[PDB]
Design a protein around this ligand. Sequence first.
Ligand SMILES: [Cl-]
Ligand SMILES: [Mg+2]
Length: 274
Amino acid sequence: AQRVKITTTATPGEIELAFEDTGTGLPVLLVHGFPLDRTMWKAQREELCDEFRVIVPDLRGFGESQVIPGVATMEAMADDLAGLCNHLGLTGKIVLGGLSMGGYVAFAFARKYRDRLAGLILCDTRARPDSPEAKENRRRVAERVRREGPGFIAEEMIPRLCCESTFRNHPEVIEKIRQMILSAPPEGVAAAALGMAERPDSTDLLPALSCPTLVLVGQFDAISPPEEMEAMARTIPQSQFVVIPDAGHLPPMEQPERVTQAIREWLRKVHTEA
Ligand SMILES: [Cl-]
Ligand SMILES: [Mg+2]
């Protein structure tokens, strides 16, 4: 892993990002969820790198990246990704993938940097904005986590994040997720919670997308359910919809091989169509 100060068009203009960059060829940038870190995507980075160049950053406020107090908007996170790609000399097109909050970041990137996208991978995510109650919940989480840290988030979220089969067959995956959450910087968690509350509605963005899009969901995802994601895919042109069996909200970790293969075979199509 690497740590680099990048130039970003978002406040504060410069930020230190930690990231992995593994493989050669077509760049595929994978964005973790909330309140996780780059290691969420480890299996896909380690396996897809035989064929693609896989770049996996810690978002601002997460993992080993710099924490920027206040509000970390989805736009700002996307701006940081554009800055990272600029740093790396990936100044043309990329494939951008994200899970859940990382999907929100991908929408923000697509709004602003459409000419930089060869493709989008939207995993276990939603196009709608937060409802008023959800926004209030963000705010209450932000104010709590600043002072108490993310233990309460792990307690609340872990039963909702993975399916029963993962708890039974892969307790080590559950523990790895728990440690990601417990290690998340408190102010980074807070800033991202507030940022999620202010993200725009991406409903009308969907029909305007201009690249192939893979829409991936766990069969048992309790947070961004498959029926909702299917409906989302029906408004995205050039979509492919994949349900990963025997996974909840974190397919990349729960069913790593199946996720890697779905992404690999779709990337080959995108490449052929391009
Ligand atoms: Cl990793
Ligand atoms: Mg469609």
